[PDB]
Write a protein that binds this DNA or RNA. Structure first.
Length: 94
DNA sequence: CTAAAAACATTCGTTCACGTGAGTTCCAGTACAAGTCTAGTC
């Protein structure tokens, strides 16, 4: 719901990162065990990037829906962090 | 001559100063992670 607590929380994230809010929102909704391998995730991300380059948001929406429906809340949060390009695992790239 | 008063010699206990090995812990130093890097228009 656009006026539901989850919608405002996702939108009002003080532009405690967005990944944590998304994980909390998706916890009661998402499954407990995903079925996507690393190769499938990489293929979906590549498709999203290519469609963005080609200016076709329908395919981007379809790929995002597939990722959302075939992953768990932890997987959703990690995918969001990867897309944003901000992980902060506590260990530097070096 | 005589004993006695003074001086001298010895051993012990206590105090102190220094040196040194061992255990505990506190902290300066080091390593590492994360953020910043100019401001605006169109």
């Amino acid at each position: 719901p656009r006026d539901g607590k989850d919608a405002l929380k996702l939108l009002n994230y003080r532009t405690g990162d967005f990944a944590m809010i998304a994980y909390f929102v998706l916890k009661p909704r998402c499954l407990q065990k995903g079925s996507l391998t690393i190769q499938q995730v990489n293929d979906l991300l590549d498709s999203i990037a290519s469609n963005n380059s080609a200016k076709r948001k329908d395919l981007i929406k379809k790929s995002l829906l597939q990722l959302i429906t075939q992953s768990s809340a932890l997987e959703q949060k990690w995918l969001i962090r990867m897309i944003i390009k901000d992980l902060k695992l506590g260990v530097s790239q070096q």
